[PDB]
Design a protein around this ligand. Structure first.
Ligand SMILES: CC(C)c1cnn2c(NCc3ccccc3)cc(N[C@H]3CNC[C@H]3OCc3ccccc3)nc12
Lengths: 286, 279, 65
């Protein structure tokens, strides 16, 4: 082929990734449906904050996908104890993620797998959403989804209650969890199970009421919980500013319709106030 | 979205002459490789067109009786795959039966219509051995089809643009009192358009609008005001003229369509079988 | 330095689509199926389907290959 294999990058139950001359190659039912999903979605998308599918190839029922080589990801940034995440760096990562998400939602696609290790960073400090293996188009009434999407630690309460139909709220809730991880350097809501994830959500943010979520009881897997008061947001994020706290509250609204979209989040005063986002060339490299 | 899609960027073509050039190129390449790998058995491009039309109707028949119910988007995607594949490929190299089945298979996967291989092949009216053979052929040709489609899998169909236009007519065009009376005939004209090459020459929005306006004209309704006033095209005379000419060309394509003749289809089927039995 | 939002400048080659939040007060939602309480609980409203249908109806209507 045209690619000389250079280095091994990872593997799993799904595929393996190699650095190759610089790009990254990810290699009776036929072609894998995850690979077909990624190919069919990334061909129709072009944005600096979305991973670019440069080429695809393979043989037989196997297939390989060629992407731009990505230097690191947000999970590595968060887990690195040497890295100091200034408010400017957090704003920069948040801004790039939200711009990519706004472009994605504008083309009626939900990522549905947002997490720090799916936000990849290159040598120029440009964040791109990756791992479109669970991404799906939304807005069609005659299209039933599954609630078992998004990693549990980043899954929205509507998903944990069995929502068959949802919108950008799942990605925005995952984005709020990612922001909380960036602030606290640890996962915000590490639930060992769906029930424990719901319990931690309700113990940190309070049990939703009828006024906070009008139709929450209509979800097929709705479970009544203790009347938790919840922790005040400024208690959890002691270093957060008022604008950042408003952004966090908008991202963590229990009502998915009331939850702030990517556009509304980008228009919030948090991204306009000083200091501005750190430029890509100055973002911390782990 | 269509306006920055691969369908518009790569699979919407300027003219029928460009499509004819592509198909003639494919036929000529297959002829040269066949005479360089070893005759009236060779198929002419128009015979290839007759076969492709017959097998697109066969693909429609396959998708209509498919169990569980096949979403119309899947059928449109599969037919678009068939047309795109045989733009640049000869039926003399890859048999249209296997290619159409592979098109349906890949369309089911791409559109997220979850169907397992056994229940897909169970729709074929053949024996379980024949179903296994067809499944193996489909699995062998799936990557070939993907490569020939240039890894452009998302297909924009005119059905959802049709829905949006009906919503717009209901909302902003009270002169058309019941737009729902322009659904059956408009969908019939949409199917007729799908029979032609218009899906490779015009946008899905243009196809949907042409179908709706043809349905209105059949009903004696003139919604030129809908284009001029509601779509504000009276503020841009050149744009309105361009759109009207696009619809007129689509109607011309529809009226000039010629269904394949059964006897001609049989003769060309014998020729195609002989071609595949050779080399 | 300081960031300022700017809407995505993407050319649709077609008629302008009314804003999503605007649809209800223009009468569009009177012609789409209402979202069930389950759908609304999940965050799905009829406005999303209506907006998608209108955008696809207007996308590339004025485009020439
Ligand atoms: C668009 C994708 C294909 C891409 C582009 N660049 N890049 C890199 N660059 C190197 C790097 C090093 C450190 C931190 C981030 C990046 C790595 C990588 N994967 C690996 C990184 N962490 C563990 C493993 O991931 C699990 C995994 C393996 C195999 C198959 C599926 C998932 N993927 C990519």
């Amino acid at each position: 082929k045209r690619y000389e294999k250079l280095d091994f990058l990872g593997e799993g139950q799904f595929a393996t990734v190699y650095k190759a001359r610089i790009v990254a190659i990810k290699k009776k039912d036929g072609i894998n449906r995850t690979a077909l999903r990624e190919i069919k979605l990334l061909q129709e998308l072009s944005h600096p904050n979305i991973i670019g599918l440069l080429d695809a190839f393979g043989h037989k029922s196997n297939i390989s996908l060629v992407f731009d080589f990505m230097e690191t990801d947000l999970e590595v940034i968060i887990k690195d104890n040497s890295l100091v995440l200034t408010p400017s760096h957090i704003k920069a990562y948040m801004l790039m993620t939200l711009q990519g998400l706004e472009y994605l939602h504008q083309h009626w696609i939900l990522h549905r797998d947002l997490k720090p290790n799916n936000l990849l960073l290159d040598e120029n400090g440009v964040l791109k959403l990756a791992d479109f293996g669970l991404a799906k188009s939304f807005g069609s009434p005659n299209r039933a989804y599954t609630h078992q999407v998004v990693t549990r630690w980043y899954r929205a309460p509507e998903l944990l209650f069995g929502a068959r139909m949802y919108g950008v709220g799942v990605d925005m809730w995952a984005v709020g969890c990612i922001l909380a991880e960036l602030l606290l350097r640890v996962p915000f809501l590490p639930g060992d199970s769906d029930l424990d994830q719901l319990t931690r959500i309700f113990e940190t943010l309070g049990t939703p009421t009828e006024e906070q979520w009008p139709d929450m009881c209509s979800l097929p897997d709705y479970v009544t919980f203790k009347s938790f008061p919840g922790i005040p947001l400024h208690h959890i994020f002691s270093a957060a500013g008022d604008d950042l706290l408003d952004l966090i509250q908008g991202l963590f609204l229990f009502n998915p319709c009331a939850r702030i979209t990517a556009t509304q989040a980008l228009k919030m005063k948090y991204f306009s106030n000083r200091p501005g986002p750190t430029p890509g060339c100055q973002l911390p490299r782990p | 979205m269509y306006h920055n899609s691969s369908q518009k960027r790569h699979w919407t073509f300027s003219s029928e002459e460009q499509l004819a050039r592509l198909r003639a190129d494919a036929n000529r390449k297959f002829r040269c490789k066949a005479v360089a790998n070893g005759d009236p058995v060779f198929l002419e491009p128009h015979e290839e067109m007759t076969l492709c039309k017959y097998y697109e109707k066969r693909l429609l028949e396959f998708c209509s009786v498919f169990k569980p119910a096949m979403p119309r988007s899947v059928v449109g995607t599969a037919c678009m795959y068939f047309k795109r594949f045989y733009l640049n490929n000869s039926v003399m190299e890859y048999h249209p039966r296997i290619i159409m089945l592979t098109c349906a298979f890949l369309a089911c996967k791409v559109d997220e219509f979850n169907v397992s291989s056994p229940q897909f092949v169970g729709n074929l009216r053949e024996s379980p051995l024949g179903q296994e053979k067809a499944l193996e052929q489909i699995l062998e040709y799936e990557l070939l089809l993907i490569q020939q489609l240039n890894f452009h899998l998302i297909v924009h169909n005119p059905y959802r643009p049709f829905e949006g236009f009906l919503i717009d007519l209901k909302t902003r065009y009270p002169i058309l009192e019941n737009p729902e009376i322009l659904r059956k005939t408009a969908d019939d004209f949409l199917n007729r358009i799908a029979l032609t090459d218009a899906y490779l020459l015009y946008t899905p929005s243009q196809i949907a609008l042409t179908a709706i306006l043809s349905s209105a004209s059949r009903a004696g309704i003139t919604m030129e005001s809908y284009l001029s006033e509601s779509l504000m095209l009276k503020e841009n005379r050149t744009c309105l003229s361009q759109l009207l000419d696009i619809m007129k060309s689509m109607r011309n394509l529809v009226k000039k369509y010629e269904p394949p003749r059964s006897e001609e289809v049989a003769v060309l089927k014998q020729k195609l079988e002989r071609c595949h039995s050779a080399e | 330095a300081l960031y300022e939002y700017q809407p995505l400048q993407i050319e649709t080659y077609g008629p302008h689509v009314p804003e999503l939040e605007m649809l209800g007060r223009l009468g569009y939602l009177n012609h789409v199926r209402a979202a069930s309480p389950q759908d609304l609980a999940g965050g799905y409203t009829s406005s999303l389907a209506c907006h998608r249908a209108l955008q696809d109806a207007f996308s590339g209507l004025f485009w020439q290959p």
